[PDB]
């Protein structure tokens, strides 16, 4: 119940690879209403990304089977996993909208959280239909675009947060919004403008930047 205890236990859960527990601890810590440090926001993101990652992988397997199929068992179990995934995404989005975005006292935090919002709406969009999907896509776009605006004002082009956001927004354009031209435009501009400064970077800086830029290049190769 003390915040320090929750953080301590999140760190233990991380070492123990208990990501659902880790997420729950971090949710409790967020709900104390104080900002998260860089270390702490990374605990939050790692935890929830592992949980949703498992659900997303399962959902893709079941959805694929269900499609090739076209009894109710596959559909039923796919729906069970889908509901669970929606639940987790909604939990993360609730933390972002009830605490994290508005309480963030600096631009870097704000970009990190608005990117997270875009990401979790994107994960919802992957499973969504109908009016739900329309609402979700609009919400994802709005979050990502706000994040983009701040990042272009506040961060240099090789900054890993800025690059990761641009990468994920480009994926949104291609995979979710069915806007390949916007996806390609964004990816190319992002890569080109980052490449322009990589010669000024140190060893560890360059690696962090280049790892994300490699994904920008991989995507462009698939999309072209």
């Amino acid at each position: 119940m003390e915040r320090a205890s929750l953080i301590q236990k999140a760190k233990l859960a991380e070492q123990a690879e208990r990501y659902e527990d880790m997420a729950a601890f971090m949710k409790g810590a967020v709900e104390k209403g104080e900002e998260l440090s860089c270390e702490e926001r990374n605990l939050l993101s790692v935890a929830y990304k592992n949980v949703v990652g498992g659900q997303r992988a399962a959902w893709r397997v079941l959805s694929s089977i269900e499609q090739k199929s076209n009894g109710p068992e596959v559909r039923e179990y796919r729906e069970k996993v889908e509901t669970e995934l929606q639940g987790v995404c909604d939990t993360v989005l609730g933390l972002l909208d009830s605490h994290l975005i508005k309480e963030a006292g600096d631009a870097e935090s704000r970009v990190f959280y608005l990117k997270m919002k875009g990401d979790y709406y994107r994960y919802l969009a992957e499973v969504a239909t109908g009016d739900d999907k329309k609402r979700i896509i609009d919400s994802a776009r709005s979050a990502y675009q706000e994040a983009m605006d701040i990042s272009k004002k506040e961060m240099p082009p090789t900054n890993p947060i800025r690059l990761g956001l641009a990468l994920n927004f480009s994926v949104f354009h291609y995979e979710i919004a069915n806007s390949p031209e916007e996806a390609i435009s964004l990816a190319k501009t992002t890569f080109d403008e980052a490449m322009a400064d990589l010669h000024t970077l140190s060893e560890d800086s360059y690696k962090d930047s280049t790892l994300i830029m490699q994904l920008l290049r991989d995507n462009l190769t698939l999309w072209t």
């Binding site: 956001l165 990468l167 790892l211 994904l215």
Partner: peptide, 10 residues
């Protein structure tokens, strides 16, 4: 191959 998001290559 498929579209890759941030963190997918570790």
């Amino acid at each position: 191959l498929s579209s890759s998001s941030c963190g997918s290559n570790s």
